[PDB]
Amino acid sequence: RPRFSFSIAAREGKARTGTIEMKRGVIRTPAFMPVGTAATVKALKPETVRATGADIILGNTYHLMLRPGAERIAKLGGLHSFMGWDRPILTDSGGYQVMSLSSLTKQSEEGVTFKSHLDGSRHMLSPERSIEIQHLLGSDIVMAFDESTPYPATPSRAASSMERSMRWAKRSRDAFDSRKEQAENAALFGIQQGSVFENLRQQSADALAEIGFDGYAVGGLAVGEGQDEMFRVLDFSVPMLPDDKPHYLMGVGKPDDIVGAVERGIDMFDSVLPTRSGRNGQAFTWDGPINIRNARFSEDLKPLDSECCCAVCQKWSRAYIHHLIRAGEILGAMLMTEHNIAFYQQLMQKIRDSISEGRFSQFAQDFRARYFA
Amino acid sequence: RPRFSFSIAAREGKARTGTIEMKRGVIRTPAFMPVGTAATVKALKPETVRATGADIILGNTYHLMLRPGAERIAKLGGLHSFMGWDRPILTDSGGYQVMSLSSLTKQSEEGVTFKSHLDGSRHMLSPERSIEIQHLLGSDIVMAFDESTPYPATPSRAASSMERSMRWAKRSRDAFDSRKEQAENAALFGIQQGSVFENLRQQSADALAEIGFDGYAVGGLAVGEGQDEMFRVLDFSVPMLPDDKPHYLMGVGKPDDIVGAVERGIDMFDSVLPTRSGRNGQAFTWDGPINIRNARFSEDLKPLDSECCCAVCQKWSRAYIHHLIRAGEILGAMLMTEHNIAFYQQLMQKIRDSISEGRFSQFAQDFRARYFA
Ligand SMILES: [Cl-]
Ligand SMILES: [Cl-]
Ligand SMILES: [Zn+2]
Ligand SMILES: [Zn+2]
C-alpha cells in the first residue's frame, strides 16, 4: 500500500464516496472515527471497535502527552502496539484541549505553555513539538497545530487567529517534512480557519493549498454556533478546499449533522457522542435517540434498535441494559458504547452505498423524516 | 441430561475430582464460580466468562431482589435469558447479605425483615420466600436459607443459630419440594453450621443428612477466622458430610485457600476476589499477586503472568494495563477481571488434572513454594 492515496469512486451533488489507502489499511469514506482519548476507545477492546466496522480511530495528543506520556509510548513501541489497534490512527494536535481543559496557559507566536489539569505539571506545545509528539506516538494522520478561535469571534480576532494558524500550518509542514520516517510513512492534514466570515475562509483555503497538505479540515465549527450556522458556513467553505483531497469536519457529531455535512462535501468525522452519550445512557436508533434510563424501558424486551445488526441488539434487551445503566454497571457502559459505535458505522455504510447508487439525496430525506418523527 | 448427577472420577487423600451433570450443562469439580452479583459478572460479557473456562456462575439473591426485582426478572423470562448466560447458575439464599449490608433488620423464628441499602424500602426473607425468589430467578442450584453466626461466637450462640438453621433447612426442603417445576429441574443444597465447635458441626451434619440434600456447604467460615483456623475446622467438618455429594465452601477465596480446601475435601468455591480485586488493580499470578498500579510496571512489556493462556496475556502488556488502571479506564477493569477469572479457572484445571493423575499433593507443594517465594 502507498503512504497515502485518496480515490473518489462516486459522486452525487457535493457528496463523495471513496477510499483512502495508507500503509496500515484502507479507510472507506465518508468515514466516522471513534475517539480513543488516552489510548483506549472507552469501554471497548480494539477488536470490538473493529468488529463494529471502524477503519480508523482518533487519539487525543493532549491527553496522551499528559498520561502515559509521549516519550514513554515511543519507548514501549508506539501507540498501535501499546493499545493493540493495528489499523490507521489519526491524532489531533493537542491545541484545542489546551484551550478547553488546561490551566495557567500562556500563548505566544511560538506556541503555548500550560499546566496539566491532572497534577499542575507544566507543559509546552508548538507546531514543532506537536508534530514531534505525534511522531513519537506513531500516528498515521497528523494534524497541523493551529490556534482555536472561540465562538462568537469578532472579524478582527478571527482574522488574527486565522493568520497565525496559517503561519503555524507552514511550520507544521516543515517540521513534518524534516523527519524522514514521518514524511515517508504518515500523512499531514491542514486546518481551515476563519470563523463565519467567507473572505477569511477563502484566504485560509488559499494559504493551505499553497503550502499543500494530504487533506483539509474545516476548523472552528461545532463550538456553539448551532446546526443552521454550521451548515451555512460549510456551504461556502468546503468548495474552497482542494476537491481531490479528503475534507474533515472535526468534532462532528450528531447523526443528522453528519448527513448534512456529507451533503456539503465532508468525507471524515470524529465525535465523542457515541461513546460518552452511551455511557450516560443515550442510545442512537433510526427513530431518534432514546434515554435507556427512562422507566418505560424497564420491561421492554426489544433490542435498542429494531434493525441494527450489532451484537448487542442480537443478544440483549432494552430492559437488561436499562437495569445495568441504572445500577452503574460497567457492562452497561460496554453494551451501550458498542451499539452506538456500530450504529454510527451502519450510518456511514448507508451513506456510502446511497452515494454509490445515486440515491443519497433520497436517503437523507428518508433518514430525517424517520429520525425526527 | 439429568436434573442432578454427581460422579467422582478420581481421588487422592480427601481430594476428589469429577462432574456434576445438570439440565443446563456439566460442571467440572473442583469448580470455581465467578460471582454475578446483580445479573452481571462485573465488567465481563457472559461469552467472556465462558471463554475463561467457567462452567457455572453465582447470583446474589439479596441484590437481585432489590434491583431489578425477582418478579420482574421472572416476567422477563428468568435470570438466564435476562443476562445472557445459558449454563447453570447457583443462587445464594440472600440471608448473609441481609446481615452484612441491610439496615433496620428484625429477626425472628419466621424469617427477617429489613430495609434496602439502596432506598430504604422494606423487604422480607424467610425459608419459603427465599426459595420462591430463587425459583422466580430460575436458579439451577438453590441454597437453603439459614441464619449466619458471627465470628467469634460463643458456644451458646453458635448452638442456637445452628439449631435454627437446621429448622430452616427443613422448611427450605419442604418449600422446594412443593413447587413441581423447581423440584424436577433444580437442585437444593443444605448448609452446615456450628462455628468452630466439633460437636455442633456433627449435629448439623447429621440433621442435614437426615433431611437429605443434593449437596452440602460448609457455612460460617471465611468470616474473620484466618486460614489456620479455617483449615482446622475443615479438617473435622468435611468428613461429617455425605461423601457422595458435592461439598461447597462458600465465599472462598484466595488461591492458597482453595488449594488447601481441596486437600480437605471441598468440591466447589465462589469468591468476589478475582473480580473485585481485579478492578482495584490486583492481578493473580503463579508467582503471587501483584499490584499493577505500582510504578515498577509502568514500562514492563511482559504480560500479567508469564504462563497464563488468557487472551489478555496474549495481547497486552503490564505497562498498558498499569496505565489503564491508574487512569480509571473501564478497559482496565475489563482486562484485569478477565485475566483474574481465567487464572482462577486455570488453577482449578491444574487441580483437577493433578488429582486425576495422583499427583495433587506434589502440585499443592509446588504451587505454594512458587506462589509464596
Ligand atoms: Cl468518550
Ligand atoms: Cl465483584
Ligand atoms: Zn445495536
Ligand atoms: Zn492472563
Side-chain angles (χ1 to χ4, degrees), chain A residues 1-74 76-98 100-102 105 107-114 116-121 123-148 150-156 158-179 182-209 211-253 255-290 292-313 315-364 366-373, chain B residues 1-74 76-98 100-102 105 107-114 116-121 123-148 150-156 158-179 182-209 211-253 255-290 292-313 315-364 366-373:
Chain A
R1 269 189 303 269
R3 176 195 70 88
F4 189 87
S5 184
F6 179 54
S7 178
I8 296 169
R11 301 179 143 101
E12 180 176 339
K14 294 182 171 177
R16 314 101 67 79
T17 186
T19 55
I20 304 170
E21 295 172 86
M22 309 195 60
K23 290 181 176 324
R24 288 187 177 269
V26 183
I27 302 152
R28 299 165 289 171
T29 70
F32 180 79
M33 293 177 285
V35 173
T37 310
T40 167
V41 178
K42 292 179 187 275
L44 297 182
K45 286 178 181 180
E47 56 195 90
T48 308
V49 180
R50 175 57 184 170
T52 72
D55 295 326
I56 170 168
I57 66 175
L58 179 146
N60 290 136
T61 293
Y62 170 82
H63 291 297
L64 293 160
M65 72 182 288
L66 296 179
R67 193 171 50 194
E71 279 84 0
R72 175 164 289 163
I73 285 172
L76 295 176
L79 183 57
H80 295 84
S81 178
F82 187 61
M83 70 182 292
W85 173 269
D86 68 9
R87 277 174 189 272
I89 295 176
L90 183 149
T91 46
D92 58 27
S93 77
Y96 181 81
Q97 291 78 21
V98 170
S100 62
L101 305 177
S102 80
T105 72
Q107 301 168 83
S108 79
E109 186 62 29
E110 289 311 314
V112 58
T113 64
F114 58 94
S116 170
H117 68 290
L118 300 176
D119 70 1
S121 52
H123 296 263
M124 180 275 291
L125 277 182
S126 68
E128 293 77 20
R129 180 57 179 163
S130 175
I131 297 309
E132 183 190 23
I133 292 167
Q134 293 179 74
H135 168 69
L136 289 171
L137 299 169
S139 152
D140 301 284
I141 301 175
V142 174
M143 298 307 302
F145 189 79
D146 65 346
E147 178 181 79
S148 317
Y151 181 79
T154 62
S156 166
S160 292
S161 284
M162 179 278 290
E163 289 157 8
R164 170 170 285 174
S165 287
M166 297 308 89
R167 296 189 294 271
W168 286 5
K170 176 59 168 150
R171 282 166 60 186
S172 299
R173 174 86 263 178
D174 289 347
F176 178 98
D177 290 340
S178 291
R179 191 172 281 106
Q182 195 175 31
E184 290 177 12
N185 296 295
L188 183 68
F189 282 19
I191 304 169
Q192 185 200 42
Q193 288 297 353
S195 185
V196 304
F197 308 107
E198 186 164 10
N199 65 324
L200 295 188
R201 289 278 172 183
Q202 184 67 70
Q203 294 174 18
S204 184
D206 290 344
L208 292 173
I211 295 162
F213 292 91
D214 296 310
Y216 299 84
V218 183
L221 296 173
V223 285
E225 72 275 354
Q227 188 188 82
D228 289 2
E229 190 74 339
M230 187 177 76
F231 283 177
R232 185 186 74 83
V233 173
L234 294 173
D235 284 338
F236 60 68
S237 291
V238 184
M240 303 169 174
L241 307 176
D243 181 77
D244 66 348
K245 302 292 190 211
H247 307 153
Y248 174 24
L249 185 55
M250 314 184 71
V252 175
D256 43 301
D257 289 340
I258 289 172
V259 171
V262 171
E263 289 179 289
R264 294 165 170 81
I266 296 299
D267 309 299
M268 296 173 66
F269 302 90
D270 73 278
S271 176
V272 300
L273 277 176
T275 42
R276 195 176 62 191
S277 302
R279 305 194 299 282
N280 195 37
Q282 178 173 69
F284 296 95
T285 88
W286 296 109
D287 299 295
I290 59 172
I292 202 60
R293 296 186 62 105
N294 191 290
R296 74 177 160 268
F297 300 114
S298 66
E299 292 182 358
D300 191 342
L301 289 172
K302 298 186 298 300
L304 291 172
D305 180 274
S306 62
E307 298 175 20
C308 181
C309 302
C310 89
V312 181
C313 290
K315 302 186 190 255
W316 297 278
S317 62
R318 288 167 171 192
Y320 182 59
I321 300 170
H322 165 93
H323 160 66
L324 295 172
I325 291 287
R326 283 233 178 179
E329 283 287 349
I330 290 167
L331 184 59
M334 289 162 59
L335 298 184
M336 286 289 297
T337 296
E338 176 175 357
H339 164 79
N340 278 351
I341 292 299
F343 180 85
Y344 270 62
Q345 293 305 330
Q346 285 168 93
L347 174 65
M348 308 315 298
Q349 187 64 56
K350 292 186 193 289
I351 289 174
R352 290 192 296 264
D353 290 335
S354 64
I355 297 166
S356 299
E357 296 175 6
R359 62 182 174 78
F360 175 58
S361 189
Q362 188 64 55
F363 169 77
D366 298 338
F367 165 79
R368 287 188 277 258
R370 188 179 165 184
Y371 195 79
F372 297 113
Chain B
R1 269 189 303 269
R3 176 195 70 88
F4 189 87
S5 184
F6 179 54
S7 178
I8 296 169
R11 301 179 143 101
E12 180 176 339
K14 294 182 171 177
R16 314 101 67 79
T17 186
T19 55
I20 304 170
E21 295 172 86
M22 309 195 60
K23 290 181 176 324
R24 288 187 177 269
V26 183
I27 302 152
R28 299 165 289 171
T29 70
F32 180 79
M33 293 177 285
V35 173
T37 310
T40 167
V41 178
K42 292 179 187 275
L44 297 182
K45 286 178 181 180
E47 56 195 90
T48 308
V49 180
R50 175 57 184 170
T52 72
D55 295 326
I56 170 168
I57 66 175
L58 179 146
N60 290 136
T61 293
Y62 170 82
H63 291 297
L64 293 160
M65 72 182 288
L66 296 179
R67 193 171 50 194
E71 279 84 0
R72 175 164 289 163
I73 285 172
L76 295 176
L79 183 57
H80 295 84
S81 178
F82 187 61
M83 70 182 292
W85 173 269
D86 68 9
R87 277 174 189 272
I89 295 176
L90 183 149
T91 46
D92 58 27
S93 77
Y96 181 81
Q97 291 78 21
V98 170
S100 62
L101 305 177
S102 80
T105 72
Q107 301 168 83
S108 79
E109 186 62 29
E110 289 311 314
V112 58
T113 64
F114 58 94
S116 170
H117 68 290
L118 300 176
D119 70 1
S121 52
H123 296 263
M124 180 275 291
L125 277 182
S126 68
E128 293 77 20
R129 180 57 179 163
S130 175
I131 297 309
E132 183 190 23
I133 292 167
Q134 293 179 74
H135 168 69
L136 289 171
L137 299 169
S139 152
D140 301 284
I141 301 175
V142 174
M143 298 307 302
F145 189 79
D146 65 346
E147 178 181 79
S148 317
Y151 181 79
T154 62
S156 166
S160 292
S161 284
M162 179 278 290
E163 289 157 8
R164 170 170 285 174
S165 287
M166 297 308 89
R167 296 189 294 271
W168 286 5
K170 176 59 168 150
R171 282 166 60 186
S172 299
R173 174 86 263 178
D174 289 347
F176 178 98
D177 290 340
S178 291
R179 191 172 281 106
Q182 195 175 31
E184 290 177 12
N185 296 295
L188 183 68
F189 282 19
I191 304 169
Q192 185 200 42
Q193 288 297 353
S195 185
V196 304
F197 308 107
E198 186 164 10
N199 65 324
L200 295 188
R201 289 278 172 183
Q202 184 67 70
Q203 294 174 18
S204 184
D206 290 344
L208 292 173
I211 295 162
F213 292 91
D214 296 310
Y216 299 84
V218 183
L221 296 173
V223 285
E225 72 275 354
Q227 188 188 82
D228 289 2
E229 190 74 339
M230 187 177 76
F231 283 177
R232 185 186 74 83
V233 173
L234 294 173
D235 284 338
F236 60 68
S237 291
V238 184
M240 303 169 174
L241 307 176
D243 181 77
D244 66 348
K245 302 292 190 211
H247 307 153
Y248 174 24
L249 185 55
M250 314 184 71
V252 175
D256 43 301
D257 289 340
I258 289 172
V259 171
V262 171
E263 289 179 289
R264 294 165 170 81
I266 296 299
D267 309 299
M268 296 173 66
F269 302 90
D270 73 278
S271 176
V272 300
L273 277 176
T275 42
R276 195 176 62 191
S277 302
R279 305 194 299 282
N280 195 37
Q282 178 173 69
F284 296 95
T285 88
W286 296 109
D287 299 295
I290 59 172
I292 202 60
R293 296 186 62 105
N294 191 290
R296 74 177 160 268
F297 300 114
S298 66
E299 292 182 358
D300 191 342
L301 289 172
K302 298 186 298 300
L304 291 172
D305 180 274
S306 62
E307 298 175 20
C308 181
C309 302
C310 89
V312 181
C313 290
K315 302 186 190 255
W316 297 278
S317 62
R318 288 167 171 192
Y320 182 59
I321 300 170
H322 165 93
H323 160 66
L324 295 172
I325 291 287
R326 283 233 178 179
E329 283 287 349
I330 290 167
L331 184 59
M334 289 162 59
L335 298 184
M336 286 289 297
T337 296
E338 176 175 357
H339 164 79
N340 278 351
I341 292 299
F343 180 85
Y344 270 62
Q345 293 305 330
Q346 285 168 93
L347 174 65
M348 308 315 298
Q349 187 64 56
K350 292 186 193 289
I351 289 174
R352 290 192 296 264
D353 290 335
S354 64
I355 297 166
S356 299
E357 296 175 6
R359 62 182 174 78
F360 175 58
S361 189
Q362 188 64 55
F363 169 77
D366 298 338
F367 165 79
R368 287 188 277 258
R370 188 179 165 184
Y371 195 79
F372 297 113

